[PDB]
């Protein structure tokens, strides 16, 4: 089964964040990311921007 009632009513709400990565590698402590949270079915998407 799939939760349909939630999908219909919280489809339009999208949460957008600006984030930075934390890890051991040193070259990748400066490049930034944009994080999208689709609350229609709790789906998280990550996009990486280039300068």
């Amino acid at each position: 089964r799939k939760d349909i009632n939630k999908m219909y009513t919280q489809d339009q709400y999208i949460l957008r964040f600006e984030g930075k990565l934390i890890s051991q590698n040193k070259e990748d402590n400066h490049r930034k990311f944009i994080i999208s949270f689709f609350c229609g079915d709790d789906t998280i998407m990550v996009y990486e921007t280039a300068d």
Partner: protein, 439 residues
Amino acid sequence: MREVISIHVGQGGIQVGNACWELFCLEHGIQPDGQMPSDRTIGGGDDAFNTFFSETGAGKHVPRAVFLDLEPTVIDEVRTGTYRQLFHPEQLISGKEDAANNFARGHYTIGKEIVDLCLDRIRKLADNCTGLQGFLVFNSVGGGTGSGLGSLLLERLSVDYGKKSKLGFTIYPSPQVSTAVVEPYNSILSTHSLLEHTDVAVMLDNEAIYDICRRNLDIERPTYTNLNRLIAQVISSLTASLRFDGALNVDITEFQTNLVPYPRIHFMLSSYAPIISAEKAYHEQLSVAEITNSAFEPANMMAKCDPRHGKYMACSMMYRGDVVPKDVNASIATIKTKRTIQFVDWCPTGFKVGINYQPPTVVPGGDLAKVMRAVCMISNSTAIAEVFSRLDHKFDLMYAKRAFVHWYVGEGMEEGEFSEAREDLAALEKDYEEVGIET
């Protein structure tokens, strides 16, 4: 990286392009001003609007379209409406004097001083893009300026660009319901012009869409706005494979390789499903099996032609939503084993299917309800010959007595131009049954 240029000519072309662009803007989040909202201040992600729009560098997005007409009223209406700041001011080319339902006027006398401007704007729009997939043309074939400018533009584009793909969504007159009285002449002439200059043509006659709207949406008095919205939905379903990720992608070039058998035979018919109103949409599961069963229903045709009277040659269907490939294949097997539908012998397998993840977008103030699954299907059939057959009957029945021929002769068109159009139509008709017979 991929771009497509849409061409709108005539009153019908403009009135359908308006609905198409409203749907595209609402689907991509574009406000009428151009900025996404004034509230979302991050942006800079998922560049998919590039197919239909073009970034100006900072802020607004300008569509990759051009409008053509000789009657300035519709262009002024577009320039005065809520989308005043959206369209570029000088890509909405407007003439001075209308063709007034005359093919010769819009093909030999008045179209010449506007074709230069149209080609200049087309070149300016083409220089911007780099991965131009092809051109789309919307033309009202029953109108003089529409037919004449469509013919001239297609003839010029066949030389200027050459191998670039062109798609034609024409609106032929309904078999019994029509507005004007002189439409057979310019309809036949336009058909002759576009026979050797259009890669793919789709029938969009009004009566079939009327019938679909009355039965499904349960509207007793619909108008052209509902028709335009349905056609825009069809176009969006067709084009969504470009700018949305999916399990199986199909491009514009993936039509004239898997749907058209011969260069002469590219006149096709379209169907859409499901069409249902919100007041009775939520009582059904709307499974892929039933939506694809309704897609093949002849009563849901967008062209007044019954495929039961002819054979199928190739069918292209696109699914969008949460569709499952295994259910797709099961439904395909079921419709193949269905007896009432038959294919031509020399085409054993006749299905090409593409799948997109994005569900169709619902426009507030419209008629359709928001759903999870949809299919848009384009099939080539032999039965389409009947619309040319009956249109032949109407033309000759009044051409025998040379009715209205002076109106065309006096505009600079040779009197004998009707004969070769008739011969071209006869040859096109003769071709279809030859393919239709078995080996």
